[PDB]
């Protein structure tokens, strides 16, 4: 009857573990309870993790935020703070972007443009409802290198935005730090992840003339709006 006692004891401990969450953390979204939380975070469908390519368990730290229908600046601030505590950040709304036009504004007789369309000249239109600006600032070289293109903080932030903002809005990223924390632009016969970019970080060495320098980090965007329309062959056509 030793097995009777053994089995009952075993079940007791399993039952105890059942309701002790910390015990089951197992350094990742491996337990059912961890997955349950991810479910509430709208990440419960298998196969979705593969579209993120990050340690998805990271998002649990943001769980209370993901329960909201909107995505506030409070969220972006949290993302930056979480990844590299010490780094400060600020968010501006209605960041302006220029949008190319499909057609120029022209004058016609048969099918003229009505002012109800609020037309603009034919080269570019403005967009102040599609982007926000996320500005970062650090107090040490370590954090700076992490934020620069090729760094691990840069990558992680984009990995999180991928899910937190998704397709809702694009984010323009820039970093404001003392010149003394930036590298001297140098050439190389071979490119590298940490190599300075012409229009973002490639600051020239100063001849022993620190002020704060604003550099670009990049831009977050999920959908590239490329062209594969394949017009149409047929369509939904029920008269009802």
């Amino acid at each position: 009857l030793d097995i009777f006692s053994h089995r009952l004891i075993t079940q007791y401990y399993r039952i105890w573990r059942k309701y002790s969450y910390p015990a089951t953390f197992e350094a990742g979204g491996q337990d059912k309870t961890s997955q349950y939380l991810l479910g509430l975070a709208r990440l419960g469908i298998p196969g979705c993790a593969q579209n993120i390519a990050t340690p998805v368990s990271r998002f649990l730290a943001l769980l209370p935020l993901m329960l909201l229908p909107g995505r506030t600046a409070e969220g972006l601030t949290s993302l930056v703070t979480l990844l590299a505590p010490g780094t400060q950040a600020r968010v501006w709304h209605h960041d302006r972007r220029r949008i190319p036009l499909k057609t120029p504004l022209t004058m016609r007789v048969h099918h003229p443009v009505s002012l109800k369309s609020r037309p603009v000249m034919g080269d570019h239109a403005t967009d102040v409802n599609g982007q926000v600006l996320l500005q970062l600032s650090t107090q040490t070289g370590s954090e700076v290198q992490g934020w620069l293109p090729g760094g691990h903080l840069y990558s992680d932030l984009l990995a999180l935005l991928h899910v937190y903002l998704g397709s809702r809005l694009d984010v323009r990223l820039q970093l404001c730090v003392e010149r003394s924390l930036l590298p001297d632009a140098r050439l190389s016969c071979r490119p590298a992840a940490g190599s300075p970019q012409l229009g973002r970080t490639a600051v020239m060495r100063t001849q022993a003339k620190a002020r704060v320098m604003t550099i670009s980090l990049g831009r977050y965007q999920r959908v590239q709006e490329h062209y594969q329309r394949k017009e149409t062959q047929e369509n939904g056509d029920y008269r009802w």
């Binding site: 730290a61 943001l62 769980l63 209370p64 935020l65 909201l68 409070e74 949290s78 703070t81």
Partner: protein
């Protein structure tokens, strides 16, 4: 040269039947402000105004957890203790 006149934190230490009434007018229904200086007349027109400070981001009244949402903390403050 030392006195801080950046903004004055005026507290309306009065019963609700009058404090709510005065507050509304102070911040929403004013025409003009003047400052009387002894030794001179009283109609000294100045540029200034009132703006509510109850909804501050600076104090927060709690060791807010990083994971907490400020919108809900605000609601608790409102219903729990109005005088703030």
């Amino acid at each position: 040269s030392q006195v801080d006149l950046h903004r004055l934190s005026l507290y309306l230490a009065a019963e609700a039947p009058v404090s709510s009434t005065l507050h509304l007018m102070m911040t929403k229904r004013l025409a003009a402000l003047y400052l009387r200086l002894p030794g001179n007349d009283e109609r000294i027109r100045i540029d200034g105004w009132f703006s509510p400070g109850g909804f501050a981001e600076e104090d927060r009244l709690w060791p807010k957890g990083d994971s907490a949402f400020s919108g809900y903390q605000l609601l608790l403050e409102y219903f729990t203790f109005r005088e703030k």
